[PDB]
Design a protein around this ligand. Structure first.
Ligand code: ZN
Length: 191
């Protein structure tokens, strides 16, 4: 089934998406997603399909060894029952970028599922035991568009996924400087 969570508490967002590069207790990955369908050269938002999730930590009555957020995300796609005659764009906003094995699985998914275009915006690059450059390039090579979250993307996710009650997205200290540094890093990685 495909009814994932729609809204998070403001502190859940702020803690997890703050783009200072340090782990600082951010052991989870949050992944927010939206789906659009192509119609007359325009991307049409399918608002009922949106949601967010996080990784499942190791639990006796869950996954004994945990399940990364990216794999949980891939697991939900078949339950959407997408119309294979249509074209879709799936945008995911991630608090950390994928580990290499997840990037590999995501790349395999998009290679095989050519009705789907994937766009990823990440708040931070997870170093991934020195493999992050390889994981990001593997995703890009399979056709994913990879970008760094900047102010506009953080604001968009706040507006869309947070129970903000009309309060504005209020940037944490250093947001622009962290986004600019990370964007410079990603530009180098992708070339
Ligand atoms: Zn992973």
């Amino acid at each position: 089934m495909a009814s994932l969570r729609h809204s998070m508490d403001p502190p859940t967002f702020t803690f997890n998406f703050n783009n200072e590069p340090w782990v600082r207790g951010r052991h989870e990955t949050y992944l927010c997603y939206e789906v659009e369908r192509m119609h007359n050269d325009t991307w049409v938002l399918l608002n009922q399909r949106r949601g967010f999730l996080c990784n499942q930590a190791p639990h006796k009555h869950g996954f004994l060894e945990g399940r990364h957020a990216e794999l949980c995300f891939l697991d939900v796609i078949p339950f959407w029952k997408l119309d294979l005659d249509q074209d879709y764009r799936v945008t995911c906003f991630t608090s950390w970028s994928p580990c290499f094995s997840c990037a590999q699985e995501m790349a395999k998914f998009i290679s095989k599922n050519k009705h789907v275009s994937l766009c990823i915006f990440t708040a931070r690059i997870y170093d991934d035991q020195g493999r992050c450059q390889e994981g990001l390039r593997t995703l890009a090579e399979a056709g994913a568009k990879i970008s760094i979250m900047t102010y506009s993307e953080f604001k968009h996710c706040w507006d869309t996924f947070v129970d903000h009650q009309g309060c504005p997205f209020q940037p944490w200290d250093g947001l622009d400087e962290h986004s600019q540094a990370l964007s410079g890093r990603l530009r180098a990685i992708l070339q």
